[PDB]
Amino acid sequence: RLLLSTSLDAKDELEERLERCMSIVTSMTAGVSEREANDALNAYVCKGLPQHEEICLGLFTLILTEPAQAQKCYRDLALVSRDGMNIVLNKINQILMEKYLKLQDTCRTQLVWLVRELVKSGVLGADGVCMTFMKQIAGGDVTAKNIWLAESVLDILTEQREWVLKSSILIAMAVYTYLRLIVDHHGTAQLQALRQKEVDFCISLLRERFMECLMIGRDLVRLLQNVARIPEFELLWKDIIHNPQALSPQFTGILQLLQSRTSRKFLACRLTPDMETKLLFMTSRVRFGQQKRYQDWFQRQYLSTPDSQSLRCDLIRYICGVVHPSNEVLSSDILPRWAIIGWLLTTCTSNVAASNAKLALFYDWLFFSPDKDSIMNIEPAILVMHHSMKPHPAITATLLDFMCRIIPNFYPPLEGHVRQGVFSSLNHIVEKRVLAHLAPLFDNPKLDKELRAMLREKFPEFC
């Protein structure tokens, strides 16, 4: 067969479609010379639409089968494709993001070769293929084969940087993903050279496409702060400080970047489809109480590595920014997100991991804007504070202390914006009363004295 499996594995109907495609494409060729073969092939393709799609998928699978046959069948596919294979590329995306868990290594290599051929030839819609293949890279992992795949696609992208240039959104996607890989990867001399290549490419993209990097969002700064020790980023930051218009005339300054918003695509794209689908299933089907089994399974299977601590922060950011449930499902008795946030926070077994997770939680709180943002970014927080008062006071106290002390520490020239965002969030909680009264929580008897004192001092309005 092609995909690794055993007898107990389910008979995959997509794979049976692929097998039927193998049958028609091979048995029709019959080892005759390519001339009559492509003549008959074009006849069968032009007979109708579903058989055209079947021939295209057979050619695609043959490209994943054997090298010489991959060359010949890619030749034949480029020769016989009618619509430019756009829906064929769609099915390539589906097969890719669905069956990559079971794809064989030789098939992986030949699929990478096909991706390189498509990118070099400049076939339309290749940006979608590039960004969905990019999405399958798992963050916070050190498997040799995954790192090799990342290096190979990086090489593909570097040789075709102009194709990235003509694809506006792909610039932002690629630079963000490679920054995430940079903060993930370290440890070996080969990884050091890989780090050098990635940082050089990212700096070149950032300078040459600063205007395009504007729409990435505030998380760009979050990636920058972890890789600020390299003198290139320090030089770029100093150049921005001295004259932000120098690098881009329309780029007035950091005001637009700070006031801007982060789109869900960047937060979503670093996760493989399986984890996102599991979280959607949990937030759509799992009732309150059963969350322990699924999350423990995911933790033991995957989140059991040194880099998993930052992966927890990544998952927290994904939940906060991307997951925006409806109010109708909120009213129902489905599993509240406070339990999810509590499980995410309690698994931080190191102080640095907890600090990173809390910074991730408070990243949206810096620049709150009621008109363009939903209350879903603070409802799990207030629910955690209200629900964890009795059973787990420690988590509530730690979060409150961190969010109270981050206000002057973060940036005194822009601490006023932090206070403005906190006041906006408090006003948003007041106007949409999730809780009956906020008064008992502000001056809770079991909380420490200084916290309540500074809460009274900073916000006399809510007193």
Partner: peptide, 13 residues
């Protein structure tokens, strides 16, 4: 399909 009358043959691929 303004270039083909509705009572004209349909080119089924």
């Amino acid at each position: 399909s303004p270039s083909y009358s509705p009572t004209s043959p349909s080119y089924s691929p």
